[PDB]
Amino acid sequence: NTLFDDIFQVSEVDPGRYNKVCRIEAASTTQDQCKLTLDINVELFPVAAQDSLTVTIASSLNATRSWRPPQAGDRSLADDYDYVMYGTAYKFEEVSKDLIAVYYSFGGLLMRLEGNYRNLNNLKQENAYLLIRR
Amino acid sequence: KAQGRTVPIPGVKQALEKKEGLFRKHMMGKRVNYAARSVISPDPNI
Amino acid sequence: EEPDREKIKLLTQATSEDGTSASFQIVEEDHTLGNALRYVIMKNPDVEFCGYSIPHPSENLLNIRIQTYGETTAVDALQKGLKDLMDLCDVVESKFTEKIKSM
Amino acid sequence: PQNENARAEALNLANTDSQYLTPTSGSPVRGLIQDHISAGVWLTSKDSFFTREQYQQYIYGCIRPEDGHTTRSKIVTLPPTIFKPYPLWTGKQIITTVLLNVTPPDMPGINLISKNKIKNEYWGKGSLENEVLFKDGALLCGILDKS
Among candidates A123, A114, A91, which has minimal Cα distance to A25?
Answer: A114
Among candidates C38, A16, B44, C52, which has minimal Cα distance to D39?
Answer: B44
Cis amide leading into A115 (omega within 30): no
Q: Write the CA distances from A69 to A46, C45, C56, integer angstroms.
A: 24, 8, 32
Interface of C with D in 16-55 (CB under 8 A): 16, 21, 23, 25, 38-39, 42, 49-53, 55
- 3-state helix, strand, coil split of chain A in percent (to 5) is 5, 50, 45
Cβ contact A71–C45 (<8 Å): yes
Please report, for chain C, the start and end positions of each structural domain, with discontinuous segments joined by +.
1-103
Q: Cα distance from A95 to chain D (closest Cα, Å)? A: 18
Report the C-alpha gap between D134 and D142 in whole angstroms. Answer: 9
Q: With residue C82 as reference, give the H or E element that holds it.
A: helix C74-102
Strand, helix or coil for residue D12:
helix
Q: Is A61 in contact with A76 (CB distance < 8 Å)? A: yes
Q: Cα distance from B33 to chain D (closest Cα, Å)? A: 9
Q: Which fold has domain C1-103?
A: Gyrase A; domain 2 (3.30.1360)
Strand, helix or coil for residue C22:
strand
Cβ contact C14–D66 (<8 Å): yes
Q: Is A101 in contact with A114 (CB distance < 8 Å)? A: yes
Chain C residue with minimal CA distance to D60?
Answer: C51
Q: Is C62 in contact with C25 (CB distance < 8 Å)? A: yes
Q: What resolution (Å)?
A: 3.0
Q: Which of C30, C54, C56 to mutate to test the interface with B (most CBs of B within 10 A)?
A: C56
Chain C residue with minimal CA distance to D70?
Answer: C14
Q: Is D116 in contact with D136 (CB distance < 8 Å)? A: no
Instruction: Please compute Rg for chain D using Cα positions.
Output: 18
User: What DSSP assignment string belongs to C85-99?
Assistant: HHHHHHHHHHHHHHH
Both ends of chain C: CA-CA distance in Å? 44
- Neighbouring residues of B21: CB distance < 8 A, sequence distance ≥ 6: none
Name residue C21's amino acid.
S
Report the C-alpha gap between A40 and A17 in whole angstroms. Answer: 14
Query: What long-range pairs does D65-71 form, CB within 8 A, spacing at least 24?
Result: D65/C14, D65/C23, D65/C65, D66/C11, D66/C13, D66/C14, D66/C23, D66/C25, D66/C63, D67/C55, D68/C13, D69/D101, D69/D102, D70/D101, D70/D102, D71/D101, D71/D102, D71/D103, D71/D104, D71/D105
Experimental method: X-ray
Q: Does C11 touch chain D (CB under 8 A)?
A: yes
CATH number of the CATH domain containing A26: 2.40.50.140
Cβ contact A20–D87 (<8 Å): no
Strand, helix or coil for residue C26:
strand
Q: In what order do the strands lie in the sheet with D139-141?
A: D112-115, D131-134, D139-141
Report the C-alpha gap between C75 and C12 in whole angstroms. Answer: 12
- Neighbouring residues of D46: CB distance < 8 A, sequence distance ≥ 6: A18, A21, A39, A108, A109, D90, D123, D127, D129
Helices and strands per DSSP (H, E), number in chain A: 0, 8
Dihedral sign from CA coordinates of C22, C80, A68, A54: positive
Report the C-alpha gap between D82 and A87 in whole angstroms. Answer: 9
Interface of D with A in 15-54 (CB under 8 A): 44, 46-47, 49, 52
Report the C-alpha gap between D67 and D60 in whole angstroms. Answer: 11
Q: Write the CA distances from A128 to A84, A97, A108, B40, integer angstroms.
A: 11, 26, 15, 51
Q: Is D114 in contact with D147 (CB distance < 8 Å)? A: yes
Cβ contact D86–A126 (<8 Å): no
DSSP label at residue B8: P
Q: Is A80 in contact with D63 (CB distance < 8 Å)? A: no
User: What DSSP assignment string belongs to D73-99?
Assistant: SS---PPPSEEESS-EEEHHHHHHHHH
Strand, helix or coil for residue B12:
helix
Chain B residue with minimal CA distance to D62?
Answer: B45
* Cβ neighbours around A78 below 10 Å, total: 19
Cis amide leading into D85 (omega within 30): yes
Report the C-alpha gap between D111 and D12 in whole angstroms. Answer: 28
Q: Does B30 touch chain D (CB under 8 A)?
A: no
Q: Does C101 touch chain B (CB under 8 A)?
A: no
The domain in which residue A67 lies consists of 1-134
Cβ contact D–A (≥3 pairs, < 8 Å): yes
Q: Is A13 in contact with A22 (CB distance < 8 Å)? A: yes
Report the C-alpha gap between D27 and B8 in whole angstroms. Answer: 55
At CB < 8 Å, which residues of chain D contact C? Answer: 52-53, 56-62, 64-68, 73-75, 77
Q: Is C23 in contact with D66 (CB distance < 8 Å)? A: yes
Report the C-alpha gap between C54 and C50 in whole angstroms. Answer: 14
- Neighbouring residues of A12: CB distance < 8 A, sequence distance ≥ 6: A23, A24, A25, A49
Q: Is C7 in contact with C28 (CB distance < 8 Å)? A: yes
Q: Is D29 in contact with D19 (CB distance < 8 Å)? A: yes
Q: Cα distance from C50 to chain A (closest Cα, Å)? A: 14
Strand partners of residue A37: A25, A112
Q: Is A39 in contact with D141 (CB distance < 8 Å)? A: no
Report the C-alpha gap between D121 and D125 in whole angstroms. Answer: 7
**How many CA atoms does the CB half-sphere of A59 hold within 13 Å?**
11
Among candidates D42, D30, D49, D145, which has minimal Cα distance to D93?
Answer: D49
